[PDB]
């Protein structure tokens, strides 16, 4: 999250308190199809990877 914020233009000081609740770290997996052309779309699977309770209404960045 700090990497993303820094990339966007906001530098959070280091060694500071930060406890979020609406964010989860996920692994995304997909299947590259045959003869795939750039611009097309595929379906992805999103899976939690640490101590999260649910991904009910989330959005993948």
């Amino acid at each position: 999250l700090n990497n993303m914020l820094s990339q966007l233009g906001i530098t959070v000081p280091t060694g500071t308190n930060m406890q979020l609740k609406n964010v989860a770290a996920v692994m995304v997996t997909a299947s590259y199809p045959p003869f795939a052309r750039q611009g097309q779309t595929i379906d992805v699977v999103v899976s939690s990877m640490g101590n999260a309770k649910s991904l009910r209404g989330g959005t993948l960045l």
Binding site: N3, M4, S6, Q7, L61
Partner: protein, 58 residues
């Protein structure tokens, strides 16, 4: 326009001209030693203080 830049990946240097911090912490220490010694003593003696008569010839 700069190229594609990831979002969650750490800021690592990737091309010519990027900067990177080095933390110089060097600490080397080597040593060696050896020795050797030797010794030898000797002391012999013999003395006939009072010789009997029948041995005076020897």
């Amino acid at each position: 326009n700069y190229g594609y830049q990831p979002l969650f990946e750490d800021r690592r240097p990737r091309n010519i001209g990027d900067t990177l911090t080095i933390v110089l912490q060097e600490n080397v220490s080597a040593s060696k030693s050896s020795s050797a010694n030797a010794s030898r003593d000797g002391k012999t003696s013999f003395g006939f203080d009072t010789v009997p008569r029948y041995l005076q010839g020897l």
